[PDB]
Amino acid sequence: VEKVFFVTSPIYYVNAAPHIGHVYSTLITDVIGRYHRVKGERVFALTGTDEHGQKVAEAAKQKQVSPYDFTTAVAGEFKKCFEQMDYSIDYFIRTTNEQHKAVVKELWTKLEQKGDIYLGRYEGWYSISDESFLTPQNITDGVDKDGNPCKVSLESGHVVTWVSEENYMFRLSAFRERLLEWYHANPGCIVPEFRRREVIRAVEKGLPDLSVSRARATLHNWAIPVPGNPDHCVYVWLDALTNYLTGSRLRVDESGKEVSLVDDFNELERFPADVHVIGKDILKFHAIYWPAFLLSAGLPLPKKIVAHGWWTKNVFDPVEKAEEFGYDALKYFLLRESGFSDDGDYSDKNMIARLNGELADTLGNLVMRCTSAKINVNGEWPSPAAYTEEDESLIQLIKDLPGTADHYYLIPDIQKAIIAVFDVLRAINAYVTDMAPWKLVKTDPERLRTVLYITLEGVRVTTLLLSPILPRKSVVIFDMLGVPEVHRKGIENFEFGAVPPGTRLGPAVEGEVLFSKRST
Numbered sequence: 001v002e003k004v005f006f007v008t009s010p011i012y013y014v015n016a017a018p019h020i021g022h023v024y025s026t027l028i029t030d031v032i033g034r035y036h037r038v039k040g041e042r043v044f045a046l047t048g049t050d051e052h053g054q055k056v057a058e059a060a061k062q063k064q065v066s067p068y069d070f071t072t073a074v075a076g077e078f079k080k081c082f083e084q085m086d087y088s089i090d091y092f093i094r095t096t097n098e099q100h101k102a103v104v105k106e107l108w109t110k111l112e113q114k115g116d117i118y119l120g121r122y123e124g125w126y127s128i129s130d131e132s133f134l135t136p137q138n139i140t141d142g143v144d145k146d147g148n149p150c151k152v153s154l155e156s157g158h159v160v161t162w163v164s165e166e167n168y169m170f171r172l173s174a175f176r177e178r179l180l181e182w183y184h185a186n187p188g189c190i191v192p193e194f195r196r197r198e199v200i201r202a203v204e205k206g207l208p209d210l211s212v213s214r215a216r217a218t219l220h221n222w223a224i225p226v227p228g229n230p231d232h233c234v235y236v237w238l239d240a241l242t243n244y245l246t247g248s249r250l251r252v253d254e255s256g257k258e259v260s261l262v263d264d265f266n267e268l269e270r271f272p273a274d275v276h277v278i279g280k281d282i283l284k285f286h287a288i289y290w291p292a293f294l295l296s297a298g299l300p301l302p303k304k305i306v307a308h309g310w311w312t313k314n315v316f317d318p319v320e321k322a323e324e325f326g327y328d329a330l331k332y333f334l335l336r337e338s339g340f341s342d343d344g345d346y347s348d349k350n351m352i353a354r355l356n357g358e359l360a361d362t363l364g365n366l367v368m369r370c371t372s373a374k375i376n377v378n379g380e381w382p383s384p385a386a387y388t389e390e391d392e393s394l395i396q397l398i399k400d401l402p403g404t405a406d407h408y409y410l411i412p413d414i415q416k417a418i419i420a421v422f423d424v425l426r427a428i429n430a431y432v433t434d435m436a437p438w439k440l441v442k443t444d445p446e447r448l449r450t451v452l453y454i455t456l457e458g459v460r461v462t463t464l465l466l467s468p469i470l471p472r473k474s475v476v477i478f479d480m481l482g483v484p485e486v487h488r489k490g491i492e493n494f495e496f497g498a499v500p501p502g503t504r505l506g507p508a509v510e511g512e513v514l515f516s517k518r519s520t
């Protein structure tokens, strides 16, 4: 089924400025998007801001400014941040957008007509900071700004308040069996696996119905009104999750401005999401509520939700560290260092260690070696002579790599894709050391042709598979290698030997480097 590969980030609350959390989530989205574009597929990558709800309105009131002004400014800060970070996101959505509001109204109305929304009551705990309803088992004792004894969330540690409101309720309980069917028929639909297991356990235990509206006073009137009932506002999460549906229906001009909302998602071939990227902190909303809504509405379900080990929401400024160590370098570090855990060492020490050892010593070294005038005297891709068994072992690794990296990218597990490429880069480095092409220039020119050609091709293929991770440096590497544009994307070019011998290398600069090593 040919469609537009649809990949999303969460949309971020605008109560506060962009920080590393949002940059990381959106980086993952961006990397996935880029990989599928290099694969030759149509892609639509989505990110944006979550602008309604009690939390934002209280932040605005804290800053003594109107919610309208406040959201607009902070959304601008997010856009500027993602421009600075050099992403390639196709559209930036804001929930204040009038077309999004229309979509929310359609979806709400569909649920209501399907009999899945009734007027009832929520009486229980609520974390305003997480916009999350919580049962008594998810709360405990803690403290607030005052230092008074209060109740806090077990999920997040944020302060919880007791709510008692007549609310529109969504019949979430009715979807338990179907959600379980969905998880089991699609055992790759939630990644990583242990988070899939978490979701299943929770749903097995039982599902309550879910408040999908709140009284307008409670939200300081900063939300989407319920269709046919102005006293109630749409829950910030039903609002928020719907952004994915809205995005899938917006025609977008060359400047990234939304120009038109289509009636039928099928017109644009995006919905549903192939990959929803999220932090672990919002798994339940994406793996339980969201698909229940879609099931109620007769809409297709997303293929994959991937939940990373960070929270979606001692200073760590990504722009600052990118200006210090390089943008691609920082992106590589964030994607290499962290698995599906809030673990890994993000210190300057380890950043420099990975920069120096992996980027400079392994990749950069090898790029310079095979393009050096001392070794590559003719400044071109040589025609190989006959291959030894050792040559063939390296070639085999290079040939196998695209299929290996492809599976990892599709899981998705970007850390493993990176590790796989670098395993091949280490192997190529070892080969070069064993063959000592610098000695071969004088000794055996025929042998050098073979060695040089394999090395070049190894660098090309590894770099191609690293191009989603290192988008700018990949271009520099291809320029040095003289790889024509046409050979820089497309699955045809994953294949060993796509760049013919005789291809000239790009020009040299006197003292250039690819990655500058840094002091220890």
Ligand code: MET
Pocket: 009, 010, 011, 012, 013, 050, 240, 241, 242, 243, 282, 312, 313
């Ligand atoms: C539909 S994704 C919403 C994510 C939420 N606004 C957050 O920042 O955690």
